[PDB]
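Why predict the complex rather than its parts? Because the way molecules touch one another can change local conformation, and only a joint prediction can capture that. The input here totals 1302 residues.
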Amino acid sequence: AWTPLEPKLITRLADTVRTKGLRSPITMAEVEALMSSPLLPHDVTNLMRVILGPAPYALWMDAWGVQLQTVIAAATRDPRHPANGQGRGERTNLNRLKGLADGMVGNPQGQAALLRPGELVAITASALQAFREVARLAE
Amino acid sequence: AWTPLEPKLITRLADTVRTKGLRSPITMAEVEALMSSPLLPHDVTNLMRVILGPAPYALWMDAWGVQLQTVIAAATRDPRHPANGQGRGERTNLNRLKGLADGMVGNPQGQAALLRPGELVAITASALQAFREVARLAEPWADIMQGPSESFVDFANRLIKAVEGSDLPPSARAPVIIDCFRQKSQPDIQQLIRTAPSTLTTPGEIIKYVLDRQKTA
Amino acid sequence: PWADIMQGPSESFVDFANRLIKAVEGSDLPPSARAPVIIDCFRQKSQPDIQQLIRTAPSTLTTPGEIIKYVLDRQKTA
Amino acid sequence: AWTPLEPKLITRLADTVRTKGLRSPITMAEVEALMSSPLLPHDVTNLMRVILGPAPYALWMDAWGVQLQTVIAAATRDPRHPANGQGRGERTNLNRLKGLADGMVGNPQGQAALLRPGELVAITASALQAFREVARLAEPWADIMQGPSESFVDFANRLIKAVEGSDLPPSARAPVIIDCFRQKSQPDIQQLIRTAPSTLTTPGEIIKYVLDRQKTA
Amino acid sequence: PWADIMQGPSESFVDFANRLIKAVEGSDLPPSARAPVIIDCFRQKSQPDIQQLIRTAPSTLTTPGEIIKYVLDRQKTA
Amino acid sequence: AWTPLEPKLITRLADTVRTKGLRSPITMAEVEALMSSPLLPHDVTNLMRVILGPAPYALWMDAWGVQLQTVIAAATRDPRHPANGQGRGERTNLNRLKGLADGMVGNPQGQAALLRPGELVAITASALQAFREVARLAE
Amino acid sequence: AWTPLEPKLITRLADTVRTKGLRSPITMAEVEALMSSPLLPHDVTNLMRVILGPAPYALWMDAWGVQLQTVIAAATRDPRHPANGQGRGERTNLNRLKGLADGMVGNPQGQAALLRPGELVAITASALQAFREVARLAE
Amino acid sequence: PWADIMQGPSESFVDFANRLIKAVEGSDLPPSARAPVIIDCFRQKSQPDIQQLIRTAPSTLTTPGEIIKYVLDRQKTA
Amino acid sequence: PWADIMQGPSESFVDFANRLIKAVEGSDLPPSARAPVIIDCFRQKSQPDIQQLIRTAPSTLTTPGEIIKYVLDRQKTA
Amino acid sequence: AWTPLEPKLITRLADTVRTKGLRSPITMAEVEALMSSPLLPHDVTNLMRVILGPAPYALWMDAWGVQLQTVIAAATRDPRHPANGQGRGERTNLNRLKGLADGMVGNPQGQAALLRPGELVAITASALQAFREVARLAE
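Output of the joint prediction:
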């Protein structure tokens, strides 16, 4: 069952990003805090939509896609990925990682249903690395 | 039984509207949050009275009336409305939607008594759409230039904001943002984008490239 | 005092409308005299650009909300 | 048997390119007209030598080579090309397409002898696409303003020309033209469009409305 | 002469309309040609502020009286 | 039998309108005075032709037509109008009110013959209201 | 069988429109000349694309649509239109007039196949009236 | 004379390239010396804005067509 | 002191590079920290024309010699 | 046995480079003179360290590396290089050309011991071409 993040925590994090900036160690610590439980693509996408401005959000979408593509290359380079399965029918496509696959587009409940925990942690680590890249790039 | 919304949440939402404005995505998210349970006309009316100023409140009353009238036209166009009933005696008049009907004027308890859940959700959706209209109305992309002293991320933020919060179709925002990056964004960055050995086909890619190769100053 | 409210040279129109409606509704006027006063104050205050914008209205505006909507539509973006 | 194109038609086409330019729709129509029958490499080469200046001719040679190389890649990707044959001995090399193969260099009769009709039509389509590329390259919408003394039909002509002859998708031209009519087109016409009792949702409708209610001066 | 009548830079509109209607009705035109001439003289004379005011009329004005009423309503008070 | 209004009274009223204007209470009182007996369309038309300038006269013709049209709408909304009759053959057309009907065009005697007293008082009240509108509009 | 108009005549007409303008009587005579035989929607559309600038072409598309809509209203007001038939299965839709119907989009040969001569003359008269409107409007 | 050709202050670049290629190919140079001369004349003529535009080319341009394409891409729209 | 070295407004780039490399190699830095410091001093000193020239390098320059070669190739002849 | 170049000749060559520059034909002739006998990597490296400034020395190191890499590509393209041998055990690596191989780093005697005469002449020609490139580049 999907539970959304508190809008109070999200508002506090947005104001933190607004006053301290993207690169302060306190901001990265707060992001790591709100990046503790494995989030669904819907959660991370809306979180970055709210805390980041328009141009940093575009940059972050780009960087997140690139990092997820690196993850999928490593996944096709190793059939023992915690997102993959043993047979070929469990291979994870980027539509399933970005939340674009069938039964997931716009629906967080179905998303949480079909996604694997390894998928969730890989998406989360990818999003964190992308946030780091964009923060280092913006300023 | 009617339970009022917390004045603490209402005060926080009012201050959010006061600092961030009516159109910020955080404000719309907060309104969607306080618009979660189906509200009675009394609740939404007092909520908009408190969070909105006088002139936006007048505009919102107008827009809410218009949207409720569209709803009632659709209701008389379909006898299977969740606010309607099967017989003609359950047809829902605008006095019952705006809370003006008999046994409802000024009394939220009686309101909650006589109203249907379909009535409540229709009123709530109408009020949300009216709030969106008024927010879009209360507060030009083709006039945006990068100032001589302005940084590029500020210019990109301002431009993307003005382009996405405008009347363009959703499928026309990215090409417009790109072509505005290319023609605005004073000639140093113009030449920096022009002499791109790779083809940049996304605002994010253009922003990344410019941030990499920009003249540190 | 409502009759002393003017739209400043740099003030936007929604702020002026908010201030004016506040001062008119929080005053000693009868309830049935607020809308005509708000309209006639929109027409005579609200510095001559908006005055001419309201004057040359092909439609007849008979409500403060309608005047506000019209002015917000056709206002000089600046 | 090879028959040359009339020098009268070629002279008329050259003067058309000289007065109207490379990108006018009348010029492209005339080129399509003289590109009706499948031409031999000699014909197209001499035609572009005559109608184009030196620098556009260099650009066109480059673009024609690139397009022919794409064609030959598609040909090696499909043995059923109308220029190819079934066996490997009919595979078509770029020397045969550009007219550089044995028995063809400088001789149009031998050229017409050895060439295939599929070869001819592929060469012709390649040359047409290369001409389009060079024409788009040889000669900004977001910088167009209506001058203080300029009429509105001239401004609309210039703006529609620059918007349709640009890199925008076809589905993004009308909204951009409308929003440029609204934000450019100096504040008298801006206010004239703003105070439109009807909603104008097409550049033609906006042009008609403005032409009706414009300030005669 | 009616075709030489212009609205002066400082003249009001009712004086200009009076002068023009006087000169048009007291002339050699047929009776069935006075109203169209008066209208088309209101549109082309009557210095460009009122010209643009008549041009941007959301309704179609088909009578000198209607044009006079419209202009008197929406005129720039000065 | 039709009796014309005195040109002396009309000249005095015209000079009153010329010096005091259209909107002064003395002018409206004088108009009410000369609007005492029910006038035929000929009388009111010539009166407004003489006392009003050309442009106010055009405005007044417009306003008089509009008010007479409102009167005729009320008349078709009530068959008991003092201008109407009981049967449908007495319904009053605008040609009969404006003096344009058959046997009335340009002839005040025939006008006075065919017109009803209710017709006369309705025409008179309409003309007075139109004069008020034009006076409020001119200045 | 469809035969295109000569590009020489079209070039001469375009230069006539360029030097004399849209409203000169010589230009209207030349347009009437090139509007002699009933043209297919493809022909008139390309002709106006070539001879008219971008903004006059937009205006002309609007006016042509309006005039064709008036024609279709008259057609549904009279089942004896030379474009219509006797039964309801021959009723002519605007997709068939503007060349947007099935089997006609972009293909002039199929266009000439399915279209009626009454359809062609109605389209032609509509286009001529639209050209007149736009010419009167542009200058 | 090819060695006397300069790009005028108001002249576009395609006109200058046309004139230069015409004068170089219609001259007494050997056929194998036209391309290097055209390139080195693009670099030293073609007033200093385009000179600096060609100088700061991240890629090496080794053909008049490539230089023309690059300059047409990155030229200062004016 | 290496951290106080700036390229003068009139100084050429090879003189500035010579002075900077001299002061960096004849200082108290470890041997493994000279190349990164020389690069980052080329990027932040070396007045903004050369700063932008190095910034907009389509290739990644990872050595002082490569930076010097690139700048000498694409420098503004003056 | 390794014999160093005279510091008197090196001082004269350094002053020649200082007064005449890098590109003068007299300077290139002097370099060709001091480039007569096949030099060990130590000799050429110290020579360029002394006669060239810091920035030209960096440029020259770059160019020398590139030219030596071209030489090693030609060497792997032909097993009959005077630096190579017949078997695969005599293939010459860039560590042996730049003097970085085992038993050579910093020791000119061991360098002269293990190096081949073909190796020496290839290194020398590479260094001369690199000097020419840097001289053409510096001014």
